């Protein structure tokens with residue numbers, strides 16, 4: 001009180017300063033780091049992809065070309081309902097990993113749907129969420145090798161499980177790498193176009209989807225992620241102004 | 245007659261002054277009052293708005309009466325002061341435009357390194373530097389006798405207090421023109437060319453990626469930005485360079501007309517550089 | 532099945548029997564409390580400008 | 587199994603009829619001659635800035651001055667309401683937090699998040715600031731709310747249907763409350779220490795007893811998820827807010843709802859509910875970038891609080907009742923008097 005109170009204020013006032021400096025120091029580190037949310041269906045090669053990308057929630061930190069990236073994977077919940085998705089609003093992009101090989105496979109309980117159809121429904125639910133309006137998606141159509149073997153010399157046919165395969169005609173404009181049989185090309189392009197159909201339905205130009213084809217043993221995934229993040233930021237800046 | 249010419253010009257100069265001051269003060273108040281519009285980029289915009297507000301409040305009025313009266317009433321110290329204010333404002337605005345263009349270029353072409361390079365404290369240094377550079381070419385020679393030349397007709401109006409007019413030697417005119425206009429112009433051209441190339445590349449990539457399921461915006465956005473500035477400020481500097489080199493080629497009335505054409509560009513800047521929806525939302529709140 | 536239903540069955544039975552009163556008495560009690568504590572509430576009626584700590 | 591299933595139906599009918607029998611007259615009919623409170627005007631008195639990211643939770647201290655807030659940047663900041671300066675800044679093990687609490691004694695602060703762990707930080711030692719005193723683990727889902735019965739024991743709610751009561755000294759669950767069919771999103775301790783209520787994603791709300799562990803009653807008025815809950819100061823009534831625009835008021839003794847609050851214009855969800863000291867005013871946050879003040883007795887809106895740039899996710903009232911504080915997804919906090 002009186003003279004005594006002034007005494008507390010100078011230390012307290014020194015005290016607010018001691019903190020503010022640390023907050024200013026931490027802000028510079030916080031701004032640079034880019035956060036990616038990793039999400040996908042069970043048994044879709046998630047651990048293999050995350051391991052090859054770099055040597056209840058799991059966070060992995062890595063750097064590429066003097067740029068810091070931070071990754072989040074939240075498998076603990078095991079929940080069909082999802083209100084933890086509300087938190088992930090500030091993420092730069094969402095990595096979605098889906099197993100293309102498992103078309104002729106059955107979810108264990110109720111025989112309600114094929115594994116792929118459930119993945120398509122999950123992607124549709126995520127894409128149209130109200131909170132995730134301005135967040136882009138990167139697709140890794142994993143298990144590419146198995147799909148070729150299941151299509152060539154395989155008793156199972158895409159026609160029975162997916163009736164629309166007969167009506168679909170593969171575009172001759174797009175071509176695979178040399179040496180691939182046309183049949184596997186038709187299979188993969190059917191798998192990709194199906195996702196793109198939901199992707200382009202209600203995008204409105206704010207957020208886009210980048211479909212990639214990946215396999216288990218590869219190292220070029222991280223470069224793909226870096227390039228896609230660069231493109232996402234460039235497109236966001238271009239749309240922020242009136243140019244695009 | 246004199247009634248007809250004086251009356252009509254009265255309805256135009258007043259409208260110009262009111263429009264300039266209203267637009268600039270509205271932009272400044274919108275930036276100052278609301279914390280949402282506070283951003284690193286908008287500091288350059290508010291600097292431009294402040295400079296154009298100063299010019300509209302100061303040079304347009306006194307200059308307007310000088311042509312209409314056909315005589316200058318204020319004394320010798322204020323003719324020089326008004327000339328210095330004019331040069332200061334023009335240079336500051338034109339250079340702030342180039343600063344904005346460079347900031348946009350860095351934001352677009354280097355997405356990852358944009359956040360580290362430009363900070364709140366860094367922008368203040370650039371704005372202070374550009375204002376000091378503008379002041380150096382404006383006040384220092386005008387306050388001194390450097391701007392004055394030796395032409396006979398000129399010696400008179402520097403001796404007589406009745407005629408306030410601008411007579412300069414070749415060196416100062418050329419130096420001021422190069423410092424103010426051409427160097428920012430080449431920079432803007434290169435910057436906008438690179439930015440347009442980047443936008444075209446991105447559009448081509450998106451069309452290749454998703455063309456089957458689904459250039460006017462870029463040309464509309466740039467064409468406006470470059471064309472308004474070029475139309476407003478290009479003729480004046482070229483005629484300013486010419487009239488010194490060639491004797492009696494350019495009449496005084498045409499020189500004054502082009503100078504006044506250059507002035508009106510200040511009013512257009514709030515429209516061009518504040519079309520964002522956030523600016524619209526805020527204006528509704530106060531208005 | 533018996534394990535799941537019985538576990539509920541027992542529950543519902545526990546909450547089945549409980550004393551209840553008419554909504555009129557509860558409304559009267561709430562109104563009496565609200566009227567009694569009206570003067571002490573600072574939000575309902577602004578206090579002197581010097582009195583409040585923030586201002 | 588069918589016979590057991592059949593029983594589950596007869597009991598419901600008896601409870602529904604018994605509830606309908608007691609409806610002598612509606613609450614609105616009782617209070618119509620009562621004069622309205624009138625227009626309410628509130629203006630910001632302090633603005634607190636410094637958080638790097640958006641704000642999920644906050645909780646006033648037992649004193650009228652102290653205040654605590656949480657954010658995803660990983661920092662808990664304990665502010666000072668009167669002079670607007672930061673006393674403590676604490677880092678966090680994980681960057682996702684959804685709740686915070688302030689002990690009645692004023693010595694401990696508890697925080698929880700997506701990681702299925704509850705941390706207790708101790709302000710008393712004052713050597714190197716705060717240190718993690720007790721770590722509480724054992725849930726299978728994210729934590730949504732945490733409050734202190736006492737310095738020794740804490741009660742938490744989880745994304746998993748179970749709620750639990752902990753003992754800090756040993757770090758083990760003393761009692762477990764079960765019965766919900768969905769995620770539990772909010773619990774409030776009653777002024778009477780014995781009882782607390784819960785609200786879940788299932789429209790049902792329940793009242794539990796801490797000693798025995800048995801759900802006393804059940805209320806199922808709502809239509810969708812419940813995101814907030816609070817008690818009337820008397821202790822015999824509580825109010826809820828849901829994803830739909832409706833905010834309802836329940837009564838414990840009458841075992842049924844008494845009044846519903848809604849407006850034609852409003853369509854956004856609710857994220858916070860609180861009462862005044864007298865109990866006349868019901869303050870509710872909204873997904874729309876505003877806060878509305880409701881008159882509990884008259885069901886008539888009285889005023890509007892505006893000034894945030896994003897949705898409001900926290901709200902609380904001081905014990906003395908002088909001021910109300912709101913936190914939004916904008917980094918800033920605001921004190922309204």
Ligand SMILES: Nc1nc2c(ncn2[C@@H]2O[C@H](COP(=O)(O)OP(=O)(O)OP(=O)(O)O)[C@@H](O)[C@H]2O)c(=O)[nH]1
Nearest residue numbers: 041042043044045046047048143144145146215216
């Ligand atoms: N032949 C082949 N096998 C693959 C390929 N990709 C993945 N696999 C196999 O399938 C497994 C899938 O990875 P999982 O161990 O199920 O990944 P996880 O992260 O545990 O899966 P979640 O249940 O989604 O969390 C890998 O470990 C491999 O054994 C591929 O391209 N070719």
Ligand SMILES: CN[C@@H]1CCc2c(ccc(O)c2O)[C@H]1O
Nearest residue numbers: 327330331334410420421424503
């Ligand atoms: C009196 N009007 C002045 C005359 C010369 C001049 C102007 C503007 C910019 C310059 O660099 C100049 O040298 C005109 O506004």
